[PDB]
Amino acid sequence: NRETLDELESAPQTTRVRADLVAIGDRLVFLEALEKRIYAATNVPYP
């Protein structure tokens, strides 16, 4: 019977974060290369 309720609750708290956003076609997407960020000194390989 057309169930539209779903859930919307807290409009959560947000923060301004330095990211990298590129527009490819009609979409906005994040360019993430995480090596220096996380894998850097850890000796775990970058997948």
């Binding site: 000194a41 850890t42 775990v44």
Partner: protein, 49 residues
């Protein structure tokens, strides 16, 4: 001090590592010479006037 990533699986559990190293200052000395002329002494020191 080095960061680590927490692995899941048959990966041996990693624990933090720390690095203490100590480099010794290299030493050196420099030179130059402006050596003075004989007559020039007997002028600037008075002594010849």
């Amino acid at each position: 001090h080095q960061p680590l990533i927490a692995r899941d699986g048959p990966h041996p559990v990693e624990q933090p590592v720390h690095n203490y190293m100590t480099k010794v200052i290299d030493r050196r000395a420099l030179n130059a010479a402006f050596s003075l002329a004989t007559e020039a002494i007997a002028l600037l020191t008075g002594e010849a006037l």
